[PDB]
């Protein structure tokens, strides 16, 4: 949990650092940014042709990541310092043994469900919540809405 908090902390801090050092007279790739282009491809604060129009969503994302990192770090510090040392007798649902195949498979299934939910959350953005940036859109690249995704087995297997 502490390591996850560290990851979220880096994400938020780097987003804030990159958004505070951004000038509009130069393109994104000319200023050494690597996290901002990730949010641009999701259709946040960009316009037709690929010109940055707004900056506030990047700030919002960075702030949210930083505060969530604070919460995660507190949780990790608690669970690592004063929490239960071995949670196989007080919390049987969360307890496990490395050699117990059924419990490990159950945990794997739970996290698979979580990852599938994350993928579906990405899918919902391109359909209903404004769409994502499409660089092949007619009349120049722009934030489109994907209405007819390709779910053909031959295309996916290709």
């Amino acid at each position: 949990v502490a390591h996850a908090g560290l990851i979220v902390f880096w994400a938020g801090a780097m987003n804030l650092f990159e958004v505070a050092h951004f000038v509009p007279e130069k393109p994104m790739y000319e200023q050494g940014l690597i996290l901002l282009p990730h949010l641009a491809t999701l259709g946040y604060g960009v316009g037709p042709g690929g010109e940055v129009i707004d900056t506030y969503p990047y700030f919002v994302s960075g702030v949210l990541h930083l505060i969530s990192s604070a919460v995660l770090g507190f949780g990790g510090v608690y669970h690592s310092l004063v929490g239960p040392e071995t949670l196989e007798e007080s919390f049987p649902f969360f307890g496990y043994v490395w050699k117990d195949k059924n419990k490990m498979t159950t945990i794997l299934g739970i996290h698979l469900i979580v990852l599938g939910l994350g993928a579906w959350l990405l899918v919902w953005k391109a359909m209903y919540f404004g769409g994502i940036y499409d660089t092949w859109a007619p009349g120049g690249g722009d934030v489109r809405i994907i209405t007819n995704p390709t779910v053909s087995p031959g295309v996916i297997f290709g």
């Binding site: 506030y56 505060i67 507190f74 510090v77 310092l81 004063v82």
Partner: protein, 62 residues
């Protein structure tokens, strides 16, 4: 309104610094976590209240 928002943000920063420096010290002392729980709980509550207040006040200064 801008001055109030900046004061709230500074208070949030100082409370966060106090929590960062104090929580490990309280948790890493023998029989210190089991006694000084009220201070940590109040600090966490003040931290959450300050972050919510800053979020609310951001809508007027931006």
């Amino acid at each position: 309104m801008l001055l109030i928002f900046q004061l709230a943000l500074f208070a949030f920063i100082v409370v966060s610094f106090l929590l960062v420096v104090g929580v490990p010290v309280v948790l890493a002392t023998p029989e210190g976590w089991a006694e000084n729980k009220g201070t940590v709980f109040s600090g966490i509550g003040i931290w959450f209240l300050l972050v919510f207040l800053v979020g609310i006040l951001n809508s007027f200064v931006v």
